[PDB]
Write a protein that binds this ligand. Structure first.
Ligand SMILES: CC[C@@H](NCc1c(COP(=O)(O)O)cnc(C)c1O)C(=O)O
Ligand SMILES: CC[C@@H](NCc1c(COP(=O)(O)O)cnc(C)c1O)C(=O)O
Lengths: 396, 396
């Protein structure tokens, strides 16, 4: 039955490193991998998680199954991280959280939930946006419609085009936001824009679905939640898919959550039972390790403090690499102006390179980057910044 | 949009312990939880895995993402465990293995694969069979059709009814087997029966889908693979979903594999790329921990030896509990005869209790069991065997 199967095409991101891991070229920079790398170009395991793993190794007495929703302390903590402490929806018990295999499994879980328990047919993802969004939503049978976003000229957020594009979206439609550090533009709404987006959202009656994966990478854990908090303040219902892959360096342990906010405790339980149903049919229960490492780190003040410092070292390092990048380019020599780069949050930014330039780079200079011209700033070290900018300026 | 959601009904297995965990009753036995428990009624973490976790804790230098298919050594090892060493399909390179979140995620992965890349509409699950099978297959959009299995009278495998029921299944249909320790009957085909089932399978042209979750619990790692090996010898293509949850006590780490056997290396790669595609849309990459604990334990001879001994202590303990159960019942006093219990493999067996008896037990005697009258033998200790059999005999 497999003799006629069509070979799948390469993923726009993976198929980059998978090839990178073949181009011997000495000096081969890589800016694809939306994974963080320190000043050494290494993706270490945070000390806090390292300490948490020792504690676990010593205390765990069993591997017996977790509830379908995962670890209680986990859900509770992510709740407070997202909605805040003393947040109404917390105190009222309007939310329910489920531990899932990473932020993607939270998406797939939201999708399947929606897809079989509601009258949702379309999802509105921005343009551009993390590629896998569409694939995930489509696999559930849902339709994906793009709302404009990037001002290719001024290198900014085109609020006008956005709203104008969003208006066509009907009520009862899911509009997907990026809590912070927009993949791949790095441009995020201001609180003001967010605050209006939350108003026009209740009116038109969309169903928010925040994809929060880089909390703490723009301005800090709390500041980064302003948006999700603005909507949460206004809506009776919402969904949020968060991931601990980055802000915790837990990439391969697949740890994230899917938080259902409904209008009242009574219904949030009903809606959640069906969510659990989706999960039970997908993977049964989530993986305990990475989640346990997160519950303990967050419920322990010594460990949380160390962690909370590591996150900011990461955050601060990427922000040093942004301006170093701007300055270095402006130094090598030529007409240009990448000052906008300094205004974008997170690990990514839109280089503003043509698909062609990008190939001249990753083939004549081995400097790898994603076709869209997206470059992972958190993969830049002070030692590769020179040949890098040389390559770039050379292809301008 | 959630105000009219229908509250999901309770799962036939979970909703048992979830209530058990509320019935204070001193002496409250529990036979639901298809999870293993030692002579103390504890589900410990094996020593081998404990040692493997220390090694990991010391050596792991990164948490960076795994390939979509998981850990190479993992896939390679599970391959040799399943098909054998020097097995043609291994040497020929006709198989591809992907690490998934437990045996269930392997199922869901096979399903989604089939569901979108082939002309498969129906799956044939036995009667009875692990409940979640249907839910999983249905969530993918596939149809589930039951083929007879249990001889409620003689307490045996009704080969006749089976074949007779299977014949209606068309070609290009997926027939799902249980490699060993049939949930919930404990009755498994003989090699002879298996060997014929493999012949009639090629003719009618079904597409095998073995659900292997209790390897090593019937007669030992190798003996337990006779079946999957019989089919593998005969078919050009097959799929197998294995789980390390039991034979490794890794329940909550979600570690299993989905092995695609095709007719040749060239196509198995094509078929696999699409499988990876399904995964990428579901959870992206698998959880590394539990899988790492398994690769190292199996690739290290000292650790494998310790583990390989632990598995047999478990296997041997359940087999002591079967005959102790038979003898004790026959001792308390009454017309009956549970000798068939001694002939069933694995942790389960069909008590042969009416839904009524089962309620008299778990409500007048607090002795919990699944409505079907399925009882987890690996939850019986020499210390609870007395009141247990008293309860049972009392409801005969
Ligand atoms: C998978 C890595 C990808 N970023 C991961 C990612 C996720 C979820 O990933 P997780 O499952 O690993 O939590 C969700 N949402 C966005 C916008 C992401 O960029 C990238 O290359 O940007
Ligand atoms: C989930 C526990 C269940 N047995 C688990 C189980 C699985 C996969 O479970 P896993 O994902 O945890 O690997 C697959 N197949 C069978 C026949 C099972 O009994 C039981 O109560 O029998």
């Amino acid at each position: 039955m497999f003799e006629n199967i069509t070979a799948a095409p390469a993923d726009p991101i993976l198929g980059l490193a998978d090839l990178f891991r073949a181009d011997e070229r000495p000096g081969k920079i890589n800016l694809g991998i939306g994974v963080y790398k320190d000043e050494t170009g290494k993706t270490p395991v945070l000390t806090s998680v390292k300490k948490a793993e020792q504690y676990l190794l010593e205390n765990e007495t069993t591997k017996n199954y977790l509830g379908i929703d995962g670890i209680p302390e986990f859900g509770r903590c992510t709740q407070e991280l997202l909605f805040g402490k003393g947040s109404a929806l917390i105190n009222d018990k309007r939310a329910r959280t489920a531990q899932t295999p990473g932020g993607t499994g939270a998406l797939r879980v939201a999708a399947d939930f929606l897809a079989k328990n509601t009258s949702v047919k379309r999802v509105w993802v921005s343009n551009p946006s993390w590629p896998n969004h569409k694939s995930v939503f489509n696999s559930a049978g849902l339709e994906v419609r793009e709302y404009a976003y990037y001002d290719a000229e001024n290198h900014t957020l085109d609020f006008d085009a956005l709203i104008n594009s969003l208006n066509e979206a009907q009520a009862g439609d899911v509009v997907l936001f990026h809590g912070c550090c927009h993949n791949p533009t790095g441009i995020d709404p201001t609180l003001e824009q967010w605050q209006t987006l939350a108003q026009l959202s209740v009116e038109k009656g969309w169903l928010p679905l925040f994809d929060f994966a880089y909390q703490g990478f723009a301005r800090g854990l709390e500041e980064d939640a302003e948006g999700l908090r603005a909507f949460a303040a206004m809506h009776k219902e919402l969904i949020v898919a968060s991931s601990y892959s980055k802000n915790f360096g837990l990439y391969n342990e697949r740890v994230g959550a899917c938080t259902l906010v409904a209008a009242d405790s009574e219904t949030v339980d009903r809606a959640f039972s069906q969510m659990k149903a989706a999960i039970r049919a997908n993977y049964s229960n989530p993986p305990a390790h990475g989640a346990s490492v997160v519950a303990t780190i967050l419920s322990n003040d010594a460990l949380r403090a160390i962690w909370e410092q590591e996150l900011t070292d990461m955050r601060q390092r990427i922000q040093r690499m942004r301006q170093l990048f701007v300055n270095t380019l402006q130094e090598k020599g030529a007409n240009r102006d990448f000052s906008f780069i300094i205004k974008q949050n997170g690990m990514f930014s839109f280089s503003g390179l043509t698909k062609e330039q990008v190939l001249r780079l990753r083939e004549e200079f081995g400097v790898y980057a994603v076709a869209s011209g997206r470059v992972n700033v958190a993969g830049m070290t002070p030692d590769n910044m020179a040949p890098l900018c040389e390559a770039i300026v050379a292809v301008l």
